[PDB]
Amino acid sequence: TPDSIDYRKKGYVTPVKNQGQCGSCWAFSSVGALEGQLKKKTGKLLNLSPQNLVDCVSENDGCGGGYMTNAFQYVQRNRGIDSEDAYPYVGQDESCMYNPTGKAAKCRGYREIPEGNEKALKRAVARVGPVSVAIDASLTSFQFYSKGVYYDENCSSDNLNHAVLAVGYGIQKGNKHWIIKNSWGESWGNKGYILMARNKNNACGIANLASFPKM
Ligand SMILES: *C(N)CNC(=O)[C@@H]1CCCC[C@H]1CS(=O)(=O)c1ccc(OC)cc1
């Protein structure tokens, strides 16, 4: 297991997106994970559609929030998810309009990382690829993050309110971190990314609700 890895450099990560004023973070986190596995299995990197999930996952609440596991389960039973091109993102709750002719991938279930275990999360990222994770992103310090490894003692490990994508991990100036892809546009953080403290007692609850799809 490498001490550092960045899947962006391997071509497993699509450009940073902007969810807008819709609580669809769970959909973006879910598609990012699927995009990573699709690349690993087919060699092709394509943008999958979060709107497909927002509109069709009946177990989630669309722009009102949802779980990534429910998203993977929908893709499995639906036997597919459309490409962004075939089901563009509008940031609004609308009726399910899944188009089978636009299917770009599918999945056959998901696996969850044991709750609170950052070590298992590290092993998963190294062996499988990008992993979907949930965190507390309610702090002002998070909203205005600009550089360095983020850590705020005020972050809650129990108040999970946002979903992002762990695309790697490493160390910066002696501080271990997780490389996180957010969905608030490129103008946020460091070109849409944030480095979050790793092995600092599950900061912000990073390993409390992690999962990845199986293909
Ligand atoms: C993202 N922009 C909005 N946040 C979320 O959807 C959170 C993702 C991680 C897990 C917790 C979500 C918030 S919630 O606990 O209020 C929620 C969970 C499940 C839902 O429906 C099934 C709806 C909201």
Swiss-Prot record:
* Compartments it resides in: Lysosome; Secreted; Apical cell membrane
Report the EC code(s) recorded for this entry: 3.4.22.38
What is catalysed by this protein?
Broad proteolytic activity. With small-molecule substrates and inhibitors, the major determinant of specificity is P2, which is preferably Leu, Met > Phe, and not Arg
Per the Swiss-Prot or TrEMBL record, the active site comprises: 25, 162, 182
Task: Please describe the organ and tissue distribution of this protein's expression.
Answer: Predominantly expressed in osteclasts (bones).
Q: Which family does it belong to?
A: Belongs to the peptidase C1 family.
Q: What protein is this chain from? A: Cathepsin K
Organism this protein belongs to:
Oryctolagus cuniculus (Rabbit)
Describe which stretch of the whole protein the shown chain covers, with first residue, last residue and complete length: 115 to 329 of 329
